[PDB]
Design a protein around this ligand. Structure first.
Ligand SMILES: [Mg+2]
Ligand SMILES: [Zn+2]
Lengths: 221, 147, 170, 110, 56, 55, 94, 14, 1112
DNA sequence: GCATCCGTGAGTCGAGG
DNA sequence: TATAATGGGAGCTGTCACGGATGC
RNA sequence: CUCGA
């Protein structure tokens, strides 16, 4: 029930490295060249640093600041570019009638190149959640019909099926294969993620995409 | 994004990437007025090709093209959008020479003219919807009924 | 740049409901001025509009009743709160304003994450949607309490954090 | 004269011209005040007979944009100039009475 | 114990099962009780709370 | 009528002259003591229109 | 959240259609001084004054509440515009 | 490129 | 109260004069106290020497200059909005070579701004500061070619705008190229012009491996220096007729002319040290005996070849090393602008010498001083480095004077500033603070001089070190440049010493920045103090060693934004610098010598010194600083008091008995509180308001002019049309508000009438006029009123009238009136608070006292800070402070805890035990035992492992107290917080960011000229900008009508906005918008570019958006 | 077919002056 | 309205990525 | 330009 511990564990405040710097050691530091100093700070913030340790840490702190500062502008610029390239894209109709689609893989080649291994849960979710099945899928004695919007439970089911070897990829409607002019159709887009239900016709999904991609731009290190 | 612990759905990135693959390059004009090496929209060349095919002509041989978001944005059909983006001079000169007509399809063009954007409540799919109470509706239905 | 707009320092407002914000009385008096003039004419507060306006021109001439009138003016209406940089659509949200004494805007804690806003000096702009159409759009599509899940990921964006999590965990 | 494009902070920040209000075009408030004035004046004029209201309008220029002489209005209604002047006077008198009664036009006098 | 992830999942499930009105009310309840309990919890920060482990 | 399109094109000398309400012949702006627009200059009311409404 | 927002969203094929309906209805109410309301006297939205409960001045609130009753009809091409205008003017003059 | 230089050259011709 | 100080490091030297970087620099530039004939060839003297003589009367020469006394004193200059300046006279003589005639005269050149005692200027009434600029030092550099590994670039850099940058490179084809003004040409040619033969170059550069063969060109050696010279002139000046004397003039002016080319003394020195040569002057070559003579080129080429080959003792240069970056201080910058102005003056002089009578020319006739005055005025008014002085508090001014900028004229253009320029270089140690820099785009580009640092005469920054000989530390202090420092092994200041001998066998040191463990035998020097590493601001943060640098940056920066309070206190925990800051900032008044205080007043202190002389010190009272904060001095002595030299006479703003007082010492509790301190928000007690803590005085200045117009004169008067006695109540007879009147928004400060514009009354106005029978007045109300959200008490009026003594306004202006309005600002919800450790937050809630958490003795806390603001910020200093604060609260004492030499945990534990005895022993004496609630909390604490089970309640409570924690009762319930809470004294400041200055709202208001869009800014009653991204947000919501409304009715649609306002005041719904005016503007501006933009309907038929108004 | 010179972008809002 | 007069004078330059004519 | 988020 220690304060730092409770805050870190609950998710209220703090991560392991910050806690470590408070209680353990400050650790290794970089030179202004990116090169790392051989001698780490053995002191924590509790114990207090020496002036030399503080000065050595300043290089890294400053580099971090300059990095952030230079990152916000490139991120804003990128966002404006994305907005200008996507702005006309709107959900204009219910269904373009395409029979084209993409296949989202549930497995990926390992770096060992030994075989294929199941992709991470979050990745599969980010590729499947709220999407419309482009073909009938039959797994674990369950029918997932063509035209079905994949709920999170459907995704988890598909993951289970993949683990049992019943499926390696999922046929899905996608903006990539949508044949709607100047936009996408409802089926190829899938869920309005903010409402966990099919997207309303008229939604400016291009703008939403640009913002969705641009927003975490300043978190990318 | 995954590396940074950011959760982002694939379909947004797919929207953008689809915008990056919007254009093609002519490898052979065929029975068309197009030129070899001419860059145009995939949609337009496919429409042209189905038109020539339905006419019994030779379709246009085209190669897929990839371009970055900047160039794709500048290569758009709408001169207002492009000019308001950047390279204003270039865009305006080419559009002026071509006598280009902006059909106000997207959001920026409409924003510039202060029009109602073709999205949300301004979508053609919803903005013509009417509302009427049953009293008024019946009072109208009787007027229709007597004529 | 736009009319019917303002800005001020933001404050926490824990007591507020998800769909509410705290709007300073004087800010509201300026932002909703024509509505207030009309309403003041409707009641006995002023003979006509011009008299009401001249009356609001000097602070020492402003009497208590005009505040009550103001309360009737804002009833059911929403304002838009905006924090720059506006990185995604949730950098603008609609809220039903509650009039407060003081000069700070009160912002709900659960919406902070979306506006990337905290209380170390942050400021926020306020805008008044005028027409019935703009108000309908704001109350239906942009209301904070109707926008709980992220458009980017589909995950909850309005959710417990900080002290809230701390208490519940405890 | 000085340039409207003189920079205030730096070239990428602000221009002197940005700080200069347009004094020519009427504000929304002014326009609405003029509108309410016209409406209230018509309201007050409706309490008169058509001839006295019309005589007042012609004599003050609310019709064709210009104020006619007593001879022009008189010739228009087919009466003596003295007659039309007397009609204008009784019209004004009634307006003053009604105004003293309702006080609806005072606030527009600034 | 209720923490960030379980509370997030609770909010999402509540959204799915009950709709946004009820979910909004749930959010305000969680807010109120969370603040209330955090107040009297006893959570604070002193220099001795930054515990150096001997192992170090 | 409703605006549906916006075209942009080169302007011919004749088109430009069709736009014009008069030629600006003098590099003058306003008069140094009356502060009124000079004749045939960049602010001439003869060309560009009246400074005051209906006057 | 707006009372019954989930049901309202359930009533339309697109949320924006809901917004359009609510807005146009609000305008209809404002144009006819609420005399054309489909709400019974007990269903009328109220606002607490200094004196007491009065009618809610907010026409959007009214519109949404009316929409929740099912007594309103919406869709495209229900009636020529001018005919609607004239009939509503006849039933409830301004 | 420089109009003054150009003019001084053209002048230098006579 | 007693002040206990910790630490064992004995500072050998005190801090230098903290503003000397300004004062000494300007003093050096002016040389005003130096009799003319003794002046050095530096500063403005050097400027004169460069400009004169002016030849082709035939000669105008300079003898000397003098500076007179200021025509007006500083305060008067602040009042009348004048520049504080001194008249400059130059003694010139005109000589005709043929006639031999000599005319001599002293000519007036205008005025030069003088620096005040504190290092600042007064320019047009406002205090300004010339910020020092960091740049690359002049000299000869060698860097690795980024394209060709193994190849190097030589760069000869002179002073800014004192010659072009010249580059020497070895081309892929082997030839050695020279680049000047972006022109690549074979260096061999220039070498030939300099008078070098193939023999000399062969014997001089033959050692290197074949490089010299890229230098060998027969066609160049086959021609004498003249032909080579003309060839070069053709290679550099295409089109220009290759005349001999023109080539000579151009090349001389490019390479040899000292009036045009100038390495600094620093550049000369560096070139000499690097190339191992000696320069006669500061140019690259000379013109001696009709020919050119080399000085720098051959040695530079020699070094370049040697470095390329691999010859030992040759290295590239780190350009960010502080031995290669120097500081241009105010003296140098001003001198540069002075030099420019003088050059223009000289051109004017020659121009006048060509004209006029040739026999009747005096120096006065030839000299027009206008361009010089213009250059000076331009420098002090509109230069980038000339900044509006920050004087929110004295520390603000002090810090502002010690700032260093990499930007500015001749400096780095931003976004071309990569990570390198912004980095903390190893050589910054002791010279430039690694902490104090802005957040955001300016990071690393604006910095601060370290506390012990001094800029030397060459402009390089130096830091002090102590000499160490045989493990013995002397009191001999040496100030070194970074270049010098790189030669030695330098021990840390905290190295254990017994007497003057190093007591450890392993000592921590630096060698070229690299940390290394050495024996005392190896130690050559030792740091003076930890203080020397950081700026003055960072040196004010106690327990700095426990704070992460990112938050230290914030606390440091935020100290400058602190507002002087009416009851300001020095911190309970200080670093020991708080007195020097007050003294050096010239805030407070100190006794000049020993003596006795004769008179003490709120306005003045009279002191009788030992000499017997009576010195009267007037006290500045309720004066307005640049930022509107109060500047006043309070007497701190009493009548008859005996004072010694340097003793305090009066406390300035933010000063408590000579100690820097940037805020308040408040009792804080570290705990969450009902969401009111969520995400950095802060909860405070109403008790703070009750006893005027965080109350600050602010003065605003309002101004109004009455001028002559073509329609009649404006005038200040009380006779304002159509206003009641109620509205004119506080106006005096002349139409100016009275002293002492309370003014509110809408109230008139100064009455003014203006003759109406030529009114053609609309028929409505005519009819209404007839109805009410009142003549429309000739003049109208144009009075100065209190703006929305402002007001207070009128404290001063100033009236300047034309036709009155000492008064002459700008042309047409009849009179100017100024009204000063003071307000006493209490802390409110939304005001920004901060501590020195980077903890900041706005007040979110002000609680009544009975709601505050309180100690068992009934004492309520003042401030509640959230613990969640600590772990991820890693600024534990604020915690330690709090602990010490706790002790200090019960012992009634203050502490000096030096950075890196501060109090340690055990000592704080001792003090907390001592304080516990006072806190609890008193209770047990008063006849009270332990409380039930305390027992409950103790049970919980036992569960938390905070106290040892088995001990008595007192022993456990004592353990908690030693952990800095106490039992706290909830004021609302009387029940204890379930855990013990960290409580203690903390120093918190109120920052200048007050919500009163920030709240702003607009319905309608002024619009712009061309765009017809609302103006921006609170002052113009402006509207918020709804930018591209906000638009994107609305688009993403599908809020089409809201957006269109923003685009049209709300901004730039004239018919739309008018109709919208009218509809709303009528209670009708707003109408459908139409075309935004800025689109019409766009169309017209495209037409002006000869482009035809046409709005068409679906049938491709034109639609007129100008409604026929623009079609003939 | 491949190095060279030129023109152009480089986050937001807000504040002061 | 007439002695004769005849080719200027600025110029510190620490970023980066792309489309382009080009032009090596 | 400097400051703020
Ligand atoms: Mg913040
Ligand atoms: Zn589709």
């Amino acid at each position: 029930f220690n304060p730092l511990y409770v805050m870190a564990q609950s998710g209220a405040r703090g991560n392991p490295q910050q806690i470590r710097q408070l209680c353990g050691l400050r650790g290794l530091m970089q030179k202004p060249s990116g090169e790392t100093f051989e001698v780490p700070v053995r002191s924590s913030f509790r114990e207090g640093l020496t002036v030399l340790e503080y000065f050595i840490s300043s290089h890294g702190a400053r580099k971090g600041g300059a990095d952030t500062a230079l990152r916000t502008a490139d991120s804003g610029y990128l966002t404006r570019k994305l907005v200008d390239v996507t702005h006309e894209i709107v959900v204009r109709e219910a269904d373009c009638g395409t029979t084209n689609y993409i296949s989202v893989p549930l497995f990926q080649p390992d770096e060992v190149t030994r075989s294929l291994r199941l992709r991470k849960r979050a990745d599969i979710e980010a590729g499947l959640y709220g999407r419309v099945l482009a073909r009938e899928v039959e797994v674990l004695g369950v029918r997932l019909e063509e035209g079905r919007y994949l709920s999170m439970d459907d995704v988890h089911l598909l993951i289970k099926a993949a683990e049992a070897g019943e499926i390696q990829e999922v046929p899905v409607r996608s903006p990539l294969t949508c044949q709607t002019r100047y936009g996408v159709c409802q089926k190829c887009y899938g869920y309005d993620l903010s409402m966990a239900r099919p997207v309303s016709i008229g939604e400016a999904v291009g703008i939403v995409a640009a913002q969705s991609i641009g927003e975490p731009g300043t978190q990318l290190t | 994004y995954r590396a940074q612990g950011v959760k982002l759905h694939d379909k947004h990135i797919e929207i953008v990437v689809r915008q990056m693959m919007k254009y093609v390059e002519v490898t052979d004009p065929g029975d068309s007025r197009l030129l070899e090496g001419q860059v145009l929209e995939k949609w337009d060349v496919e429409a042209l090709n189905e038109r020539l095919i339905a006419e019994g002509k030779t379709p246009v041989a085209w190669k897929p093209l990839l371009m970055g978001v900047t160039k794709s944005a500048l290569s758009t059909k709408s001169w207002l959008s492009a000019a308001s983006f950047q390279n204003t001079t270039h865009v305006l000169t080419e559009a002026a020479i071509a006598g280009k007509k902006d059909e106000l399809i997207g959001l920026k063009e409409n924003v510039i003219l202060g029009r109602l954007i073709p999205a949300g409540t301004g979508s053609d799919f919803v903005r013509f919807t009417q509302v009427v109470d049953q009293k008024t509706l019946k009072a109208i239905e009787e007027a229709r009924k007597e004529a | 740049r736009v009319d019917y707009s303002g800005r001020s320092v933001i404050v926490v407002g824990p007591q507020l409901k998800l769909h509410q914000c705290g709007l300073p009385k004087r800010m509201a008096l300026e932002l909703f001025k024509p509505f207030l003039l009309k309403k003041m004419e409707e009641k006995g507060i002023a003979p006509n509009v011009k008299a009401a306006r001249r009356m609001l021109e000097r602070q020492r001439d402003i009497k208590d009743e005009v505040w009550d009138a103001l309360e009737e003016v804002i009833h059911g209406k929403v304002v838009l709160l905006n924090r720059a940089p506006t990185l995604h659509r949730l950098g603008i949200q609609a809220f039903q304003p509650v009039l407060v004494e003081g000069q700070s805007i009160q912002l709900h804690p659960l919406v902070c994450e979306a506006f990337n806003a905290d209380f170390d000096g942050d400021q926020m702009a306020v805008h008044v949607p005028l027409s019935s159409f703009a108000q309908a759009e704001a109350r239906i599509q942009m209301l904070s309490a109707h926008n709980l899940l992220s458009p980017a990921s589909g995950e909850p964006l309005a959710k417990p954090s900080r002290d809230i999590i701390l208490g519940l965990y405890y | 004269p000085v340039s409207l494009e003189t920079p205030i902070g730096d070239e990428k920040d602000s221009f002197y011209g940005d700080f200069i209000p347009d004094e020519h075009l009427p504000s929304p408030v002014d326009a609405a005040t003029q509108s309410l004035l016209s409406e209230e004046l018509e309201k007050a004029l409706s309490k008169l007979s058509e001839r006295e209201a019309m005589v007042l309008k012609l004599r003050k220029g609310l019709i064709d944009g210009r104020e006619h002489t007593l001879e022009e209005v008189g010739a228009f209604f087919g009466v003596t100039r003295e007659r039309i002047r007397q009609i204008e006077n009784k019209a004004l008198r009634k307006l003053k009475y009604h105004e003293s009664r309702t006080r609806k036009l005072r606030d527009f006098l600034d | 114990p209720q923490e960030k992830n379980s509370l997030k999942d609770l909010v999402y499930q509540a959204f799915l099962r009950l709709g946004m009105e009820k979910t909004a009310r749930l959010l305000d309840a969680l807010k109120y009780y969370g603040f209330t309990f955090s107040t009297t919890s006893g959570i604070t920060i002193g220099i001795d709370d930054a515990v150096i482990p001997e192992e170090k | 009528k409703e605006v549906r399109k916006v075209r942009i094109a080169l302007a011919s000398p004749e088109k430009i002259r069709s736009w014009s309400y008069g030629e600006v012949e003098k590099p003058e702006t306003i008069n140094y003591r009356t502060l009124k627009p000079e004749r045939d200059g960049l602010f001439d009311e003869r060309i560009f229109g009246p400074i005051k409404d209906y006057e | 959240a707006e009372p019954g927002i989930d049901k309202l969203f359930g009533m339309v094929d697109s949320k924006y259609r809901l917004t359009v309906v609510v807005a146009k209805r609000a305008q209809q109410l404002l144009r006819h001084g609420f005399k054309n309301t489909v709400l019974e006297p007990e269903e009328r939205p109220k606002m607490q004054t200094l004196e007491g409960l009065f009618d809610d001045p907010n026409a959007v609130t009214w519109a949404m509440k009316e929409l929740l009753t099912g007594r309103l009809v919406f869709g495209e091409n229900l009636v020529p515009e001018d005919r609607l205008q004239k009939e509503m003017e006849r039933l409830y003059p301004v | 490129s420089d109009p003054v230089r150009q003019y001084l050259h053209e002048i230098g011709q006579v | 109260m007693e002040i206990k100080r910790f630490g064992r490091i004995r500072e050998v030297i005190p801090l230098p004069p903290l503003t000397e970087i300004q004062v000494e620099s300007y003093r050096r530039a002016l040389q005003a106290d130096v009799p003319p004939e003794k002046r050095e060839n530096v500063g403005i003297q050097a400027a004169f020497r460069e400009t004169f003589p002016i030849e082709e009367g035939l000669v105008l020469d300079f003898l000397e200059y003098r500076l007179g006394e200021p025509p007006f004193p500083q305060d008067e200059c602040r009042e009348k909005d004048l520049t504080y300046q001194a008249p400059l006279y130059a003694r010139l003589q005109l000589i005709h070579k043929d006639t031999g005639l000599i005319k001599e005269d002293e000519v007036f050149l205008g005025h030069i701004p003088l620096m005040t005692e504190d290092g600042s200027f007064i320019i047009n009434g406002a205090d300004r500061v010339i910020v020092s600029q960091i740049h690359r030092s002049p000299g000869v550099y060698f860097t690795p070619d980024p394209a060709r590994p193994g190849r190097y670039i030589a760069s000869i850099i002179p002073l800014p705008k004192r010659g072009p940058w010249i580059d020497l490179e070895v081309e892929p084809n082997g030839v050695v190229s020279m680049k000047v003004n972006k022109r690549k040409f074979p260096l061999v040619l220039l070498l030939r012009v300099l008078g070098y033969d193939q023999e000399t170059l062969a014997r001089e550069l033959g050692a290197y491996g074949e490089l010299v063969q890229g230098l060998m060109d027969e066609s160049v050696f086959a021609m004498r220096p003249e032909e080579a010279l003309i060839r070069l002139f053709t290679l550099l000046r295409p089109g220009d007729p290759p005349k001999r004397d023109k080539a000579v003039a151009y090349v001389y002016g490019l390479i040899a002319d000292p009036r045009r080319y100038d390495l600094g003394e620093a550049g000369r020195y560096k070139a000499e040290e690097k190339l191992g040569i000696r320069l006669s002057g500061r140019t690259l070559a000379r013109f001696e005996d009709g020919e050119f003579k080399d000085e720098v080129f051959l040695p530079t080429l020699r070094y370049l070849f040697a470095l390329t080959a691999g010859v030992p003792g040759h290295e590239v240069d780190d350009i960010d090393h502080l031995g290669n970056r120097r500081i241009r201080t105010v003296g140098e910058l001003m001198t540069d602008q002075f030099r420019v102005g003088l050059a223009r003056l000289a051109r004017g002089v020659r121009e006048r010498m060509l004209m006029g009578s040739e026999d009747s020319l005096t120096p006065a006739k030839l000299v027009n001083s206008r361009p010089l005055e213009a250059a000076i005025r331009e420098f002090f008014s509109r230069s980038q480095l000339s900044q509006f002085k920050d004087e929110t508090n004295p520390l603000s001014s002090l810090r502002h004077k010690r700032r260093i900028s990499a930007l500015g004229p001749g400096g780095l253009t931003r976004e071309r500033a990569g990570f390198d320029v912004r980095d903390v270089h190893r050589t910054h140690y002791g010279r430039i603070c690694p902490v104090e820099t802005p957040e955001g785009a300016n990071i690393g580009l604006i910095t601060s001089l370290a506390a012990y640092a001094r800029v030397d005469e060459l402009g390089f920054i130096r830091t002090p070190y102590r000499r160490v000989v045989g493990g013995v530390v002397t009191d001999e202090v040496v100030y070194m440049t970074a270049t010098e420092e790189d030669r030695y092994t330098i021990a840390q200041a905290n190295t254990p010493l017994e007497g003057n001998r190093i007591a450890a066998e392993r000592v921590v040191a630096r060698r070229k920045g690299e940390p290394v463990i050495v024996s005392p035998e190896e130690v050559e020097f030792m740091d003076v103090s930890p203080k020397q590493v950081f700026s003055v601001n960072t040196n004010l943060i106690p327990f700095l060693e426990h704070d992460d640098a990112n938050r230290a940056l914030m606390g440091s920066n935020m100290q400058t934004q602190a507002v002087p309070l009416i009851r300001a206190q020095a911190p309970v925990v200080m670093t020991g610098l708080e007195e020097r800051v007050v003294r050096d900032s010239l805030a407070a008044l100190y006794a000049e010598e020993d003596g006795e205080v004769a008179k003490v007043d709120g306005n003045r202190i009279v002191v009788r010194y030992e000499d017997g002389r009576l010195v009267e010190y007037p006290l500045r009272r309720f004066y307005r600083s640049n930022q509107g904060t109060a500047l006043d001095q309070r007497p701190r002595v009493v009548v008859g008091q005996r004072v010694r030299k340097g003793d305090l006479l009066a406390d300035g703003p933010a000063s408590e008995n000579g100690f820097l007082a940037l805020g308040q010492n408040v009792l804080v509790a570290i705990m969450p509180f009902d969401g009111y301190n969520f995400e950095d928000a802060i909860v405070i007690s109403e008790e703070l308001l009750k006893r005027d803590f965080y109350t600050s005085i602010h003065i605003e200045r309002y101004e109004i002019e009455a001028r002559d117009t073509k329609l009649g004169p404006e005038r200040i008067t009380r006779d304002i049309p159509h206003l009641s006695e109620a509205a004119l109540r506080d106006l005096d007879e002349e139409g100016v508000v009275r002293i002492g009147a309370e003014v509110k928004p809408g109230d008139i400060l100064v009455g003014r009438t203006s003759f109406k514009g030529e009114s053609e009354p609309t028929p409505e106005e005519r009819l209404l006029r007839s109805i009410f029978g009142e003549k429309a007045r000739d003049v109208k109300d144009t009075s100065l009123r209190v703006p929305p959200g402002e007001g207070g008490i009128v404290v001063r009026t100033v009236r300047l009238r034309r036709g009155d003594p000492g008064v002459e306004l700008k042309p047409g202006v009849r009179e100017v009136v100024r009204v000063y309005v003071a307000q006493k600002r209490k802390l409110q919800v939304g005001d920004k608070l901060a501590n020195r450790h980077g903890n900041k937050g706005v007040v979110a809630k002000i609680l009544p006292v009975e709601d505050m958490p309180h100690l068992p003795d009934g004492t309520p806390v003042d401030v509640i800070l959230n613990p969640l603001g600590v772990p991820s910020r890693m600024n534990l200093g604020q915690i330690l402070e709090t602990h010490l604060g706790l002790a200090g609260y019960f012992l009634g004492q203050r502490y000096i805890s030096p950075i890196f030499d501060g109090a340690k945990e055990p000592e704080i534990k001792e003090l907390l035990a001592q304080a516990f005895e006072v806190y609890f022993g008193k209770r047990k004496g008063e006849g009270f035992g332990v409380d039930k609630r305390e027992v409950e909390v103790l049970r919980r604490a036992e569960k938390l492992g905070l106290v040892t089970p088995g001990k008595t309640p007192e022993e456990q409570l004592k353990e908690l107290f030693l952990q800095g924690k106490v039992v706290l009762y909830d004021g609302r319930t009387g029940e204890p917080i379930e855990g013990p809470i960290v409580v203690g004294q903390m120093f918190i400041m109120k920052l200048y960011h007050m919500v009163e200055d920030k709240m702003h709202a607009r319905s309608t208001g002024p619009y712009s000229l061309i765009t017809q869009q609302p103006l921006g800014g609170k002052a113009q009653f402006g509207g918020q900008r709804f930018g591209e991204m906000e638009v994107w947000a609305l688009e993403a919501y599908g809020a089409a009508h809201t957006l269109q409304e923003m685009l049209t009715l709300k901004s730039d649609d004239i018919e739309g906005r008018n109709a919208a306002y009218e509809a709303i005041i009528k209670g009708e719904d707003v109408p459908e918008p139409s075309v935004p005016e800025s689109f019409r503007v766009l169309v017209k501006e495209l037409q002006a570019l000869a482009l035809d933009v046409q709005t068409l309907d679906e049938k491709d038929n034109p639609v007129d958006i100008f409604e026929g108004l623009a079609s003939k």
